[PDB]
Amino acid sequence: SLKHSVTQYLEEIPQQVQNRLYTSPATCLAIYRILPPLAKFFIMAMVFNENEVPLLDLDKWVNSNGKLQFQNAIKSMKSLHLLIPNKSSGTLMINLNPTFKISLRNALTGGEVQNSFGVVVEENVVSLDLLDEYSANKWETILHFMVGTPLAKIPSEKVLNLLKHSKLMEEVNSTGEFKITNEGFQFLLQEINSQLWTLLLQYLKMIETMDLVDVLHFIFMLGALEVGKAYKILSETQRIMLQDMRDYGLVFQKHSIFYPTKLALMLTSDTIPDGSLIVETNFKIYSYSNSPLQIAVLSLFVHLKARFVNMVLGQITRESIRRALTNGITADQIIAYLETHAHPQMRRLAEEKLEKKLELDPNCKEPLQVLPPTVVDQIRLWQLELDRVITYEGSLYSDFETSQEYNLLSKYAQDIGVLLWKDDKKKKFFISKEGNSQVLDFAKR
Amino acid sequence: DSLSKEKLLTNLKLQQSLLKGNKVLMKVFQETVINAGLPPSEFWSTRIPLLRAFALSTSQKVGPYNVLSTIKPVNKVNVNLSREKILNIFENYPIVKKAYTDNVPKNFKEPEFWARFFSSKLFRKLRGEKIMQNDRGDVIIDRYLTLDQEFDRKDDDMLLHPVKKIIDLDGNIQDDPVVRGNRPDFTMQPGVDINGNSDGTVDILKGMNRLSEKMIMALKNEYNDERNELKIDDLNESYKTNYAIIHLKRNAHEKTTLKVSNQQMLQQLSLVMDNLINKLDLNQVVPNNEVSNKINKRVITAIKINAKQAKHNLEVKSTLPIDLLESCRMLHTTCCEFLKHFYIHFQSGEQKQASTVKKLYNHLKDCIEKLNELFQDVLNGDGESMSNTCTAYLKPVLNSITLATHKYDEYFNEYNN
Amino acid sequence: ESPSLLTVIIEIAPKLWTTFDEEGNEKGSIIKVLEALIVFLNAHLAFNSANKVAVIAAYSQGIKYLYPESTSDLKIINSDMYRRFRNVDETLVEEIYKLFELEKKQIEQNSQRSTLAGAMSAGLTYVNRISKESSLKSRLLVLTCGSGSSKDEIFQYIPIMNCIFSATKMKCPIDVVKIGGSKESTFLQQTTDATNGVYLHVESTEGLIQYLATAMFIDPSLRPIIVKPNHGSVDFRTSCYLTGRVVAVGFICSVCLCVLSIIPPGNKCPACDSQFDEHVIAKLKRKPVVPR
Amino acid sequence: MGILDEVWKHKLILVETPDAQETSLALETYRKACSNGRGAILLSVARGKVSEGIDFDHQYGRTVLMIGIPFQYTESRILKARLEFMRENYRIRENDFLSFDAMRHAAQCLGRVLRGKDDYGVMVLADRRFSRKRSQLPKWIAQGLSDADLNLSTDMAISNTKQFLRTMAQPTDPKDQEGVSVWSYEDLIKHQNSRK
Amino acid sequence: ASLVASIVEARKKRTAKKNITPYQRGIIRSLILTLDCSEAMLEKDLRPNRHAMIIQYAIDFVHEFFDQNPISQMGIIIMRNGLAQLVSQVSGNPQDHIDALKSIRKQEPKGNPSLQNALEMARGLLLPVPAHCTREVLIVFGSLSTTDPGDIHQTIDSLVSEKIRVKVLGLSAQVAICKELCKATNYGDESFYKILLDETHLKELFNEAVTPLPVNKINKGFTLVKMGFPTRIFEDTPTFCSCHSKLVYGGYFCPNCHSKVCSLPTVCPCCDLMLILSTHLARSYHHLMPLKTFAEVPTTEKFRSEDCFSCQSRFPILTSSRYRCEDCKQEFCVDCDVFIHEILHNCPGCESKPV
């Protein structure tokens, strides 16, 4: 939902603020990268002719088989205020955002970029030895800090405050310690560009006027940037948060020349295997992977034995399972990790068993779990045996009369999100004590 | 045998047989001959491979096998009889067939008969079981014991034949008729019982040998050489293929139903290399939005045309009345049958085919008029609401039919006129 | 969905380009085409982050692996453009200038055979190489200058058919861009129709940016939900071997299998020398027998 | 036991009759059965009338079930007097001579499989006591008799026989035998010069 | 030391393919695959059982045969319980036989075989077949014996007289009668009674059987054949088809009698003439124009180039992996050699080199 989250945020961004974002070619290039294929095709077609089109021509062009996907593309196109659809001459006359159009055109032609792709110094050096090494160092420090295994190099105070305020890896002030939230484990499960995008979305949400569009344009060009060169130190708000993301280890800055590491490239785009684990009914771990980070994250939910070159061995204990459970870490998160860490031989065996059971019966009279339930459902049985109850606390309305209070005001209560529970035949439904915003108002009628 | 075109056309019973097998074949044949009165020989003349396939499917038969060996004795016993295996027993043992046919249609029942048969010692004798006086057998079935014995004698008499001297062990043992040595061992000679009589293992072994001989002479039914026999192929020349290679002479005709100069292309080449080293601008590629608008018009026109092509991407769903749909499909089918037979007559090319061609031409004309009258029916049934679609659906076969009529008329004017 | 391995073959030949620009007046039209293709590869590599591009040019005497550089430094283009786009465009303009300098050097010898089929085959081999490495969409692009003299497509026909069969095995559409006086190129049109490719012929070098940006953008990620824009239809017929005209109903050898619109002279095969049967050919020559 | 009923389902079974004429008809039946390929089995005594001039080849000689040691009848006074006389004459060990006659009869039984070099066959020894007799056995016979083969069971006998059939079901390049097994006239000339 | 074994194995392999010939090979084919479904193929001895793998391999065989040679008709008759059962008439549509084989999937193989009955009705099915069509039968077999009603030798003589060949792919080992069939039918050749050694070998054998076979000089049938290219229409209205008698949006149109059909390469149902496309006839031109093998140059000698001519990659360096097309005098890598020799059917070095 990364593109969904960013698109949602930009839809939250108003129309003229969006148009301000559509001014510069680097921002337009990054946003074009965000757009789905259909809308990407539409804008690359229309960008080289100043002919507005009606919707009817596009509809006649569009094959109706993917019409839902077309609707999604144009819904994003309109809701981002990237389109100006007006019903001119009775027809919904389709118009791209013109600033976006011309900035995309200049980016494609290599025309006027105003160094939106970057105020270049072009003093290239080696990046694998300084930039990549410092980047790996700083990211290792922040990563083990997020893990909770002890490490001396604490992060910045800005990100420390952002973690304190945010629900990510809770620095619980009563305990004085960063603590793994379920959101923290979601961040741990996240892909690296997902983690970066969540971090920048949270930082953009917390940061206020520091010009928001300056941060937006700078973020987009920073994603647009390339590795291993010096560049001019631009807006000053951009410069100071550039120093901030220098302290994050994103850029290797020599206090004016700065050298962006590979993290900008991964932020822009992604780039018996490694990370593939053989499950065991004896809960033994046969990982085809090793890192001290791997051991650090496996310490949270796996009882391990020793570290060898790719062979990380161990045995999953129920103590490890319940250690994961008691942190608020979801068993769905656990199986997210597990099903992202499967192995070729065992998944081939699972697919062979699935194709064997397909011909016998469609249901098979077996629980729906594709990963082999000899080991996988043992956690899933422990997953179901973990939660296994439903608790309702607070207020409760009871002993109703007839279903005019259910199909008219409790069926409507599904549309507004105020009930915690719904039982028509019991003539009772449960709400939270604090969730009495619009519950004791229309139920009286 | 039953393999000629005449034989396959003659077998009316087989024709009725696969008729009754199919259902659309009653539909087609009924319309063809019951309704249209086509010569049914010419009806079946197309379906000759189908007729022969049906005949050969019905015609095969299995090979012999040791049905008594496959019989198992299986507390109590329940008869689980298979009629094909019962007839297999009948064919393998005409004595058992005779014992069935003189007792069951005269005295008692079939399952009772087979219970008596399984009880009988004659069954044990015919199977691989040594007879025993402790066994009582069935008296009714075991009355046939001496009859089966004289059957065995007659069959052995039939099975006797002269032997090749190349393998004749009788000639081998008749090498020296005055061999005077010692009496051979009891161990290696055929042993007997205490009272000098045999146990009968020689009888059961010669019996199973008789079974083998009977099987191989059943194979040897209606349905010098030692030079070839003693060839030593291992020291002979290897066989080499006489397959012919093929070459290919290559001389193809040019495609049937201003010239540039080296100086001018060299001048242009020099100029364009000059332009190439001179300059190259990506930004000038942007068009003038007017000729580009004509490009938009051309592209969109192509999209509209090919989209209308793609708009018409079990048969198709139709809003026809189902009875009229079936009737028009039937008429289309019989018209296609008529057309194919008319083409068969026409492409045959004989003066003997002339009256056939004329009569099928008349039938095609009749089909045309019946199509028109059907069009009148859907005319006054729809007010041409979808009678137009009816006419268009029946159109192309009508066009091909009337094209064939024009071809027939043209060739009539070519030859006669 | 997946990175589409882009396959672009450019048929460069002065015998065609000189003919086209002398027929018209747009000198540097090939340069315009090259710039348009530069923008096309930019649009493609901006459509997906890894949809890698194979660029090969076939000159008069052979072919050349343009992109990338071989397994064994001026900058005409601007420094403000993208890094990967700039790298590819600089590499291609350097390779193009090197090939054109070479073509100027060895201009004076004569080779009358088109190398389009060989270029297509080598590109298909490289498609196999890329797809076997590491899942990648295969889409093949040909750029030709059709204004030159249509000399002999007969020897080109057979390997073109072989390439069609191979791409059919490889699920690669063969999309054809033609610029020339002749509206139709029958073998290319048949190639597009069989391989589910796209045929297009125009004349003006202007507007090809809009042309092949709009039409020539169909990827296998979204092929079934895009109608093909081709309007021509092909009978998939061939000209006769000894009369050179296309045949609807005719005769072929039982051995050589070449089309014979008429009876061969001497009743022997004009391709593989097979003498045929006189009664057979008399039955073929038989008129229908008609009643008087 | 009715085992022969099971045997019926695969091949015919032919037994040496005491009548040589019926035996001749039986062997003709076996010949024709292997000719049509439906398959048959012969049952003949080791010293029986078949064993002294009838060969079997390329479908007839394919596999032989020799049953145990074909020892003579032990309690013959005639045999014992022979043993005494031959021992008195040439100092012959009696049991050794008995083993001699047994193995020579076994060799006569097993020698009727390989007519040409193109043929192939498999030999069995269905007695425990045969293992000490490879030194007795003829040299070319025993040269194929490997040391692992000296004591086998039914299971690896079956496996090896199936693999042998798989092996003999393959063609062979003539180059591998053009100068070492099959000799041309020039090959014989070259060999003769090499001897020279 | 594995490379020396690989080299000598490649030498012993290439000794068979040293001789490459432009024999006249049959194009108008007539292929029959009979199936036995008996007690023998119930053995699970090969995984999962012989019946399942011959079903799967027959699916593949149908696909490959129709792809390579679409100018033939395919008939399948099963053998079961002492009866040979026709399940697939000869047809141009492979999908019919695919559905029939799918029916054969769920049913249970049982019984005993009868090659006499099987080959007799195969002969009868092959009886109404035109002269140019090459009648040939593939037979799979798992038994070591055959129960039959009568003589096989009369059938052998009749099959030889009616110019039909056979090729037997036996399962367990050689059967002498099948060897006799292959030899006598095949002019004394022994290159037709083939026994697999594993399932991979069975796959290779099926792929070998896919290919067209050469014909004999004495078996001369050199003639012409009438042919007609039809025309495809794309109409707005659905139209009744001649073959299946149902409404069709498109469909080819008959070149002669102007009827319409539903599939190609098929014969007309109305003017009764065969209709194809030029692609279909050119499909076998690699068989018509074979490709010479490419020779690795030795590692000792001086090298024309050190990287691959075609795929454009560096040649690896003990021995030299530079497969040279002597027809174009260019060396290539093993990957390109494989692709040009199997997938492609032209040499781009010979395409660039002018003649």
Ligand SMILES: [Zn+2]
């Ligand atoms: Zn020919």
Ligand SMILES: [Zn+2]
């Ligand atoms: Zn149809």
Ligand SMILES: [Zn+2]
């Ligand atoms: Zn026709």
Ligand SMILES: [Zn+2]
């Ligand atoms: Zn290569």
Ligand SMILES: [Zn+2]
């Ligand atoms: Zn070559």
